[PDB]
């Protein structure tokens with residue numbers, strides 16, 4: 215295979231993450247059964263590593279699905295860590311990685327042996343290796359869910375120091391989330407184009423790809439707006455470049 | 465008992481944290497047994513909620529003890545969340561809550577029911593209820609170990625907006641950490657007295673309790689220094705007060 219092998223102590227981690235996340239859920243929704251969630255998640259783990267479909271994770275999403283505060287969703291591209299860091303375990307925001315079905319699988323990897331019945335710790339199929347692998351189908355399922363369940367003001371943090379462009383016209387946000395946003399429940403969409411401190415300003419609002427994304431969102435009938443280096447997040451990046459001039463306080 | 469009962473799903477959480485922490489450990493140190501560790505830790509959950517000594521966690525420490533990067537230790541008082549936050553899971557610094565024996569219990573509570581054998585999810589003997597309770601003893605033990613395995617530059621984060629002064633003469637830093645710092649392997653001690661954004665500036669370097677701390681550290685032969693609102697951390701605080709003037713950029 216060409217992707218990272220299945221995560222060590224996957225079950226241990228999974229159940230643990232799920233365990234801690236409960237305290238975060240509202241009482242009415244605290245009732246989650248992690249072992250049931252794990253048992254359901256495993257259904258895809260038993261199948262051929264190149265024959266897993268998003269729909270396989272339907273049961274898993276059923277037992278772990280839960281509400282997302284209006285105005286607290288945070289979609290993103292090329293900024294996984296920064297997103298996790300800023301959101302702060304649902305405190306500031308609630309990105310997919312901060313929703314039960316996302317938290318449990320964040321940064322992890324998994325797949326069954328190509329021929330054997332165990333877990334392949336050597337390597338898992340990437341997108342190229344074959345489309346229907348467990349990790350991709352999972353995130354396709356989870357992201358679709360996350361999008362349908364979002365509401366209010368939708369925020370999107372993009373990387374403007376990304377060589378190839380801020381908005382990947384072919385990533386999860388573009389292919390699986392935007393097509394699944396519920397217009398009736400969304401008031402407007404806000405984009406945060408974050409540039410690296412000092413880093414290359416490859417693209418800012420309304421430039422290049424950001425023009426495509428903007429045109430598409432508007433064509434769809436959404437209310438659009440874009441911000442460059444949204445201050446709160448700029449400050450966070452600054453935590454690691456305090457001496458740099460872009461991070462100097464008055 | 466004047467303290468919160470044992471955390472729900474204590475074992476799952478303990479085991480989950482441990483599992484994920486291994487990934488951060490160095491290769492020739494990554495070989496840890498989370499179940500054995502939990503088993504050792506649990507020895508205290510089989511005792512009288514008021515008859516647990518730091519020694520009882522000895523074996524637990526033996527099975528979890530691991531080296532701490534030089535210059536990476538970060539002691540603190542009155543700023544638990546900010547410390548954890550700024551430390552970023554061993555990325556920026558490595559506080560006791562980011563050491564395996566400290567991570568597995570960070571923010572969790574526990575203690576067995578006085579009479580019965582089961583855990584008490586109702587309450588737990590707080591320091592005043594009786595000194596030798598499960599939680600306190602655990603930390604006394606974890607603290608001493610942490611102080612002992614520290615070397616290089618010692619950073620300490622204190623809270624200058626604290627109503628009682630930045631340095632508590634009776635606290636873990638005071639009663640268990642400072643007393644166990646191996647002087648021979650410490651270059652110097654640096655203090656960060658952080659003030660709330662706009663918040664009350666009760667004390668700053670060289671004032672109030674800070675004079676008491678500074679004297680002891682020096683008298684002890686350490687090389688002392690103090691910084692009001694260390695910039696990196698100030699910027700982190702600023703993340704939640706971007707519009708405030710103390711957080712204004714240029």
Ligand SMILES: *[C@@H]1O[C@H](CO)[C@@H](O[C@@H]2O[C@H](CO)[C@@H](O)[C@H](O)[C@H]2NC(C)=O)[C@H](O)[C@H]1NC(C)=O
Nearest residue numbers: 292293294295296373374375376377410413414
């Ligand atoms: C935003 O995009 C840039 C460019 O892709 C990312 O920078 C790269 O980060 C990796 C990991 O640290 C480095 O190996 C590369 O050398 C970086 N490239 C450059 C030109 O510096 C950056 O990490 C992204 N920011 C976020 C928050 O994801």
Ligand SMILES: *[C@@H]1O[C@H](CO)[C@@H](O[C@@H]2O[C@H](CO)[C@@H](O)[C@H](O)[C@H]2NC(C)=O)[C@H](O)[C@H]1NC(C)=O
Nearest residue numbers: 542543544545546547623625626627660663664
């Ligand atoms: C620094 O100390 C202050 C003083 O307690 C903390 O602020 C208080 O926080 C508590 C809750 O943790 C509130 O009930 C009080 O109203 C706050 N008082 C003030 C004056 O702000 C502050 O959170 C501490 N900072 C850190 C990082 O621990």
Ligand SMILES: NC(=O)c1cccnc1
Nearest residue numbers: 310311320321353357386
């Ligand atoms: N970890 C995440 O939040 C995530 C991963 C893959 C696709 N979309 C979101």
Ligand SMILES: NC(=O)c1cccnc1
Nearest residue numbers: 560561570571603607636
């Ligand atoms: N919980 C903690 O991280 C902690 C408790 C007591 C002393 N030092 C650190």
